[PDB]
């Protein structure tokens, strides 16, 4: 009688597992039936040019995140002031704003007409900066939140003691706080990188040309059809499984 509930749960859960598996799986599967194209795609240096631009651009957003996001994540896990409610909301803004809008909004500020752009002698549009700013905005919250849980996990006493043993707030931070939440900062970073990499909407609208993996696929999809994009898709899928399972095996 209990196998019915034990299976009901097992069944329902094995469904979404296939749902999320089938597509990804299938597309890479079928890349056998046309291993010629797949191989060519794999060799296509146009792809690799994009892949790198992608990975590298997203890697910058992450660093920017860690570098500015961490401090905030600490402040959120520890101190509690009147504003918080707001500060916490601002951090989650990007999660509610659809990709496209994000891009548009970003454009309204980093384009040569933007409050910021009109000053930044660094050009954003159709430039890494743009891509960065795009990816950043969309992944910043993702990092911060993870970084927060990090600091949140560290026993405050540990920090108390550390000051007790005569250690400035600054000392404590780098010797107790940080080192202890590293496995969260790291995870958070990796996660924000996966976010940047996966972004399409926010990006396309700011800088189209220094082309990103997501775009190159969309273009070929529209330009040559489905069967002309599958290869690049599968390449990008596999390309990711590797990079991430790799990272996991280098942390767990």
């Amino acid at each position: 009688m209990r196998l019915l509930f034990s299976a009901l749960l097992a069944l329902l859960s094995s469904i979404i597992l296939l749902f999320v598996l089938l597509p990804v799986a299938a597309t890479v599967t079928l890349q056998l039936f046309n291993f010629d194209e797949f191989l060519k795609a794999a060799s296509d240096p146009a792809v690799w040019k994009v892949v790198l631009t992608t990975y590298y651009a997203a890697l910058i957003s992450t660093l920017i995140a860690v570098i500015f996001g961490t401090p905030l994540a600490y402040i959120l896990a520890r101190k509690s002031f009147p504003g918080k409610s707001v500060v916490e909301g601002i951090v989650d803004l990007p999660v509610v704003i659809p990709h496209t809008v994000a891009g548009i909004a970003l454009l309204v500020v980093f384009g040569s007409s933007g409050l910021i752009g009109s000053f930044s002698p660094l050009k954003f549009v159709d430039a890494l900066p743009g891509i960065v700013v795009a990816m950043l905005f969309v992944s910043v919250p993702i990092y911060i939140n993870q970084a927060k849980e990090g600091f949140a996990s560290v026993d405050v006493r540990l920090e108390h003691v550390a000051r007790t043993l005569g250690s400035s707030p600054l000392r404590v931070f780098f010797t107790v706080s940080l080192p202890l939440s590293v496995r969260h900062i790291v995870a958070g970073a990796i996660m924000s990188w996966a976010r940047g990499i996966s972004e399409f909407g926010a990006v396309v609208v700011i800088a189209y040309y220094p082309m990103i993996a997501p775009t190159l696929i969309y273009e070929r999809y529209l330009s040559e059809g489905l069967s002309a994009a599958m290869p690049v898709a599968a390449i990008l899928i596999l390309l990711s499984l590797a990079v991430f399972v790799a990272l996991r095996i280098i942390v767990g």
Partner: protein
């Protein structure tokens, strides 16, 4: 009075207003769970500024000072051993202000003075309850602490073990002539270590002195609390 503390602190529906004088010996304040013992210590510690009042240590006002510039050695319930650091590095933390070789000296010196110099490479988890307690103390002492705060440093420990440990505390205190403010809810500990005994109840330190005195002079509050002697006496009767 080596340590004087007159201060008020509000925290929710909790109010901590104390008047506490302390010797240069082994003080021990008794108090049920939730009497304010831990904040009291964080106060002395300088990990909590009081709303009103001050904390004098050696006649000198310490309140404006940071937990870092005060000399106090702090130890929180279930010790705060840095889990990402080896026994050695744990003990060494707090000496970043000392010459290198000198630091290593002091470290190993204390590591030996506490019989842990062999665990110098392990990390907190590999340590036994007792091993922690030692590392804890080790790291707290190498700083040549003006004072030494502890709370429930003996909770979650079998009676059998407790006794041996208490004797070790007595020793450590006589050995390093380091005054100690030990906080618990257990009479057995007060009775076994204290040179003086305070008694906290609801953030207020009702009375201090010596156990014997505290009993006789029954005021129906501290009297009630210290009435546990009967159970300790009934038990001694029922055994051996």
């Amino acid at each position: 009075m080596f340590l004087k503390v007159r201060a008020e602190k509000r925290l929710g529906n909790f109010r901590l207003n104390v008047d506490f004088e302390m010797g240069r010996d082994y003080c021990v304040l008794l108090g049920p769970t939730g009497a304010g013992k831990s904040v009291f210590l964080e106060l002395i510690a300088g990990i909590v500024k009081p709303d009103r009042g001050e904390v004098r240590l050696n006649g000198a006002d310490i309140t404006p000072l940071p937990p870092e510039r005060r000399g106090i050695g702090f130890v929180p319930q279930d010790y705060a051993l840095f889990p990402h650091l080896s026994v050695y590095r744990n003990i060494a933390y707090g000496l970043r202000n000392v010459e290198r070789v000198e630091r290593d000296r002091r470290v190993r010196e204390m590591a030996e003075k506490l019989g842990i110099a062999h665990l110098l490479d392990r990390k907190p988890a590999r340590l036994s309850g007792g091993e922690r307690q030692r590392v804890a103390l080790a790291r707290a002492l190498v700083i040549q602490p003006r004072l030494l705060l502890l709370d429930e440093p003996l909770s979650a420990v079998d009676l059998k073990t407790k006794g041996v440990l208490m004797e070790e505390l007595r020793f450590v205190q006589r050995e390093f002539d380091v005054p100690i403010l030990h906080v618990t809810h257990d009479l057995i500990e007060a009775a076994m270590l204290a040179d003086e005994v305070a008694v906290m109840l609801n953030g207020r330190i009702v009375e201090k002195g010596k156990l014997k005195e505290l009993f006789s002079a029954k005021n129906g509050e501290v009297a009630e609390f210290l009435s546990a002697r009967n159970l300790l006496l009934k038990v001694s009767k029922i055994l051996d």
